[PDB]
């Protein structure tokens, strides 16, 4: 969000937000799919890796190009910049590739059903299957996996390069204006470490969050179209939308409740940072000049470093009991909802695995907030330090 | 492995290694089970969480205690020390708890067979199952998961405390001899953070390595006793130990070929570190003086940071094609070995899932060397910096 890169850190983010929301609303519910009426949109989608060129996807690709092109033109003429190409188009392409990989995930999920149905048939009757069919099934799966591998590799290359361009942009800005900026103590640490740590952490957190939201939106309709087979949940009974309600409640209450039981922690982390810095700064003075050792003083400083460093190891069991309980119940909560439906014999081995995998993929893509402590510990420290390091 | 902690970093580690080897040779293959001859070790093992009190385990608990007791006693007498209790016995307890958690993993593995056999019966002949059986299966699974939760929480508490004792030990050793150590450049930085970073990282890597070896050793006999139901491998025909051979080759060769094709990376990372540090020092002069800014030289230093630091971004696609190919093919290579057996109808749904889970657990617990890269970038740097900071 600096002035060197991302043309204007003011109205820009509001503009991006309002345009993204308007375009989503027009496409989803406003029936933009009447573009599908202009063309011969068949609307039936294969399961092979010939999925990604049928007209249904190709219309979407063209539509995405049109939107980003318009939004880019407006800021290319309203107020220019030096790194506009990277700051606009690079971010557009990163978002698009994240969406694409989510779609590959959905494709494999849709493949899970016929395979396990074929296995059930083969087990129950040795007199109907032959090995060629199994070889063909593995054939289609590898057909998809090849495209997943290529996209993932190229994407990692590009994101790393874009992050480096951010780093060089703010380094150019900071070194253009050194004379005024020279006299602030510890500037070399700033201009050498803070920029890179800042850029990388920001990129990582942003992409993780957008991936989470896109996974949720991508998998809700499948659950809606597949919940026609599971009418009755075990204890409550019969609910019109048992699966979708249960999935949303489990996932979102799991995360929300898991990140409210562990709310005190960033305060403790900050306090520990402060006391560490005080001990360090005291130790610097005794390096260069007269005694400044003062064993009583060092003992006092260390005891302060200690007593305030145990409280973090104790207000932290509360946060591991909850996490492990949630993570260990989750292995069988996905399959606990299908006892009465299995007994009633409506779902078959192959419609059970789709559901188990839907729940597992949503859980495996909603793991970020257990690894999101970094952004609540080091990123705010860097932002406060680096902004305070500007007049 | 310093002098203040760990009584003598010389003969201690060698003595511990050879004593571990002697004890294992006595128990595993030399016929230690004859202690189970003296007492009434039935040798039959339940499936619930009542597994861990039967004599079959309780003997092993007693034998582990005796071995560690003897080893620790010899060193208590031969070479006394101050942190001897933490240094000897804390390490003993961490090893033991890691083995215990591996055992919990094995128990849940052995549980997946009856549950899936039950589901197959419930789908193929609905009049033979009534729902209370499903509820009892869930009951026993939660019975195990509870013990997993409690042990994990307590173990994390203890590990954190042991690491902080390592830190306080080497801090006291360094700060006792400050005066001779006073004039080295940057004493405060070293004695302020390198101690913690070194101790914590060494702990994490040691535990991960031991974890991998114990998972492999614990899961081989299962595959030996369970490879009798899969006579024919897919193409090569009939091989006496087809399953175990295939598992070993796939896992170990996968890691070996993954960590030999990405061997050039540590040198490039170290070079980038060195050039960035040179830039740092060159800027530091320009912080107090006047004629050190020198935009030409700063330009040259930045270009050195640029040209050199793209090679790393490029000799990284090579290491990311291999990792993704391996991690994708593994999703179906586990089930590719059971096609002729499935077609012939020899295995039942329940030896399919137990084998697939064996392969999945070995692979998922051998995930270290793609995330234990740290030993190639910082820990070596920290050890070298902190040893050279010691005359």
């Amino acid at each position, epitope marked *: 969000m600096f002035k060197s890169f991302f043309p204007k850190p003011g109205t820009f983010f509001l503009s991006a937000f309002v345009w993204a929301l308007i375009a989503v609303i027009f496409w989803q519910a406003g029936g933009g799919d009447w573009v599908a009426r202009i063309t011969g949109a068949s609307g039936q989608i294969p399961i092979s890796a010939a999925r990604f060129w049928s007209l249904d996807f190709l219309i979407f690709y063209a539509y995405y190009i049109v939107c980003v092109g318009l939004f880019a033109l407006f800021w290319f003429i309203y107020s220019p910049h030096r790194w506009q190409y990277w700051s606009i188009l690079g971010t557009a392409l990163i978002i698009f590739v994240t969406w694409f990989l989510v779609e590959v995930g959905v494709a494999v999920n849709a493949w899970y059903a016929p395979f396990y149905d074929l296995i059930q048939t083969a087990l129950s009757s040795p007199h109907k299957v032959t090995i060629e069919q199994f070889y063909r099934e593995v054939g289609v799966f590898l057909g998809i996996a090849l495209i997943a591998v290529v996209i993932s590799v190229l994407n990692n290359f590009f994101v790393s390069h874009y992050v480096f361009r951010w780093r060089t942009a703010m380094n150019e800005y900071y070194m253009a204006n050194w004379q005024q900026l020279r006299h602030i103590e510890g500037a070399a640490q700033r201009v050498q470490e803070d920029t890179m740590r800042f850029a990388s952490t920001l990129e990582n957190m942003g992409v993780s969050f957008i991936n989470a939201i896109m996974t949720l939106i991508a998998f809700l309709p499948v659950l809606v179209t597949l919940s026609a087979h599971v009418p009755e949940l075990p204890i409550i009974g019969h609910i019109p939308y048992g699966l979708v309600i249960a999935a949303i409640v489990w996932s979102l209450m799991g995360t929300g409740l898991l990140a409210v039981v562990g709310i005190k922690l960033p305060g403790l982390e900050f306090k520990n940072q402060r006391v560490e810095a005080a001990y360090r700064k005291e130790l610097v003075y005794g390096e260069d000049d007269a005694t400044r050792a003062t064993p009583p003083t060092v003992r006092e400083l260390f005891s302060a470093v200690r007593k305030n460093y145990f409280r973090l190891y104790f207000h932290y069991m509360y946060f591991n009991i909850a996490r492990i309980l949630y993570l260990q119940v989750d292995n069988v909560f996905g399959l606990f909802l299908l006892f009465p439906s299995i007994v*009633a014999g409506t779902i078959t081995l192959g419609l059970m695995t789709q559901i188990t995998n839907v729940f597992g993929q949503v859980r495996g893509a909603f793991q970020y907030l257990i690894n999101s402590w970094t952004t609540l510990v080091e990123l705010m420290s860097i932002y406060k330090r680096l902004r305070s390091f500007e007049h | 492995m310093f002098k203040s902690f760990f009584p003598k970093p010389g003969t201690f580690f060698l003595s511990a290694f050879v004593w571990a080897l002697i004890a294992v040779i006595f128990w595993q293959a030399g016929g230690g089970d004859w202690v189970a001859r003296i007492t009434g070790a039935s040798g039959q093992i339940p499936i619930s969480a009542a597994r861990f009190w039967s004599l079959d385990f309780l003997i092993f608990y007693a034998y582990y205690i005796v071995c560690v007791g003897l080893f620790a006693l010899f060193w208590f007498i031969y070479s006394p020390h101050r942190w001897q209790y933490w240094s000897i016995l804390g390490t003993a307890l961490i090893i033991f708890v890691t083995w215990f958690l591996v055992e919990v993993g094995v128990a849940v593995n052995a549980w997946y067979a009856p549950f899936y056999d039950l589901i197959q019966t419930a789908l193929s002949s609905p009049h033979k199952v009534t729902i209370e059986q499903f509820y009892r299966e869930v009951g026993v699974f939660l019975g195990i998961a509870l013990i997993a939760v409690v042990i994990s929480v307590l173990n994390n508490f203890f590990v954190s405390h042991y690491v902080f004792r390592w830190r306080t030990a080497m801090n006291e050793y360094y700060m006792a001899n400050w005066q001779q150590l006073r004039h080295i450049e940057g004493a405060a930085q070293r004695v302020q953070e390198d101690t913690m970073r070194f101790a914590s990282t060494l702990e994490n890597m040691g535990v991960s390595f031991i974890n991998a070896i114990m998972t492999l050793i614990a899961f081989l006999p299962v595959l030996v006793t369970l490879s009798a139901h899969v006579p024919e491998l897919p193409i090569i025909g009939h091989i006496p130990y087809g399953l175990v051979i295939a598992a070993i080759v796939w896992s170990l060769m996968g890691t070996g070929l993954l960590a030999v094709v990405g061997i050039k990376l540590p040198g490039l990372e170290f070079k980038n570190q060195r050039v960035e540090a040179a830039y740092r020092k060159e800027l530091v002069y320009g912080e107090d003086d006047a004629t050190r800014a020198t935009p030409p030289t700063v330009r040259e230093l930045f270009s050195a940071v640029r040209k050199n630091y793209f090679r790393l971004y490029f000799h990284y696609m090579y290491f990311n094609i291999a990792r993704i190919l391996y991690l994708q093919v593994d999703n179906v290579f586990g089930l590719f070995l059971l096609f002729p057996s499935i077609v012939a109808g020899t295995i039942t749904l329940g030896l399919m899932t137990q084998i697939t889970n064996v392969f999945g657990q070995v692979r998922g617990a051998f995930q270290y060397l793609i995330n234990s890269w740290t030993t190639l970038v910082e820990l070596m740097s920290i050890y070298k910096r902190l040893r050279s900071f010691e005359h």
Partner: antibody
Amino acid sequence: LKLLDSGAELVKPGASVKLSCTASGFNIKDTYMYWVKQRPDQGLEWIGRIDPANGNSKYDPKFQGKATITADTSSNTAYLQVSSLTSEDTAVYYCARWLVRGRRGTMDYWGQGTSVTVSS
Amino acid sequence: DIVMTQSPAILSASPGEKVTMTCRASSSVSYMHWYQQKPGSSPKPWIYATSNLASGVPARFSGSGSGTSYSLTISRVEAEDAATYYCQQWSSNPRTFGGGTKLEIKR
């Protein structure tokens, strides 16, 4: 409960016949509906069954390829189709119903049977 | 095919007495049932899974056993119980009936 088998039926050698068994008083989504044959030697035999909830069937391997069982949950009913009648298909055929979900009461109830006579 | 052998194939009794019949399997079954067919009528369970009596029938009918050997006992045969008693196993998917033992009443 009430099961109402069809009426008696004489047929010509080599032809085929279709039989029906209508159930009133319960919902056939909860049950099996098998069939049983009783030749004049009073020994009983098993022919096949069907689960109307999803539509699977299983047959006695000796009787496979001879007679097929189909159902229709719209109007509670099951049907059995015997083909290539020979001199050895003079018998009586009884439907049934076995509870599999919602257990209570008599767990098996037999219809009334439809004499089948084949000759010239 | 589990072959059920059933004996004695003829029986006799008088009111007030006690009688037994046996339907011995040929492997493990665990699932059996006992019927009763009168002349010109359709069969009818008595015992479900070899212990549980079905809906209201006189309490003199009961049987027991496990493994591969079972028995049925009629406490006090009376004038209304001339019939033919079958047995049905159930634990496979072909299913095999039994032989039937015509029961008589003396006078």
